[PDB]
Ligand binder design. Structure first.
Ligand SMILES: [Cu+2]
Ligand SMILES: [Cu+2]
Length: 148
């Protein structure tokens, strides 16, 4: 029903990781230059966000971020598939196919936590995640239509 600051960070940290791995693969495997630029931005932003959340987590809860089970498909965690990306005939298509719902997931988590948090740090972070990742979705949707 409702995320807390702690639970959000615990779930979002692993989720930001799979995205980064997808984006790192794009640096070499992407076909369109538009996509490599998006990938450099995703890496930059999401790694910066991971760091802020990890710092905040230690400050507020007096422990590092807890590492349950690993992140992968089959459990409704809405995780991604790096193997399928690497083997796809059309890299950019498969990247966009997987990244859009993954981005939408983050936007929805952010919007929800934004109604539950009292912390200005999280409010600010949620704002940026929503705004930045919604524009990235909009870019990817347009590119997908043009290319395919
Ligand atoms: Cu994820
Ligand atoms: Cu499993």
């Amino acid at each position: 029903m409702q995320w807390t600051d702690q639970s959000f960070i615990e779930m979002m940290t692993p989720h930001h990781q799979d995205a980064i791995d997808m984006a790192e693969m794009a640096l070499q495997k992407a076909e369109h230059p538009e996509l490599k630029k998006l990938a450099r931005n995703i890496i930059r932003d999401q790694e910066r966000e991971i760091k802020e959340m990890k710092t905040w987590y230690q400050q507020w809860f007096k422990r590092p971020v807890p590492a349950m089970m690993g992140m992968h498909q089959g459990h409704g965690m809405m995780a991604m598939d790096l193997d399928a990306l690497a083997t796809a005939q059309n890299f950019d298509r498969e990247f966009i196919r997987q990244m859009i719902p993954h981005h939408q997931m983050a936007v929805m988590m952010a919007s929800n936590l934004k109604t539950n948090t009292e912390r200005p740090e999280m409010d600010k972070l949620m704002d940026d995640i929503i705004r930045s990742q919604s524009a990235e979705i909009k870019q990817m949707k347009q590119w997908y239509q043009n290319w395919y």
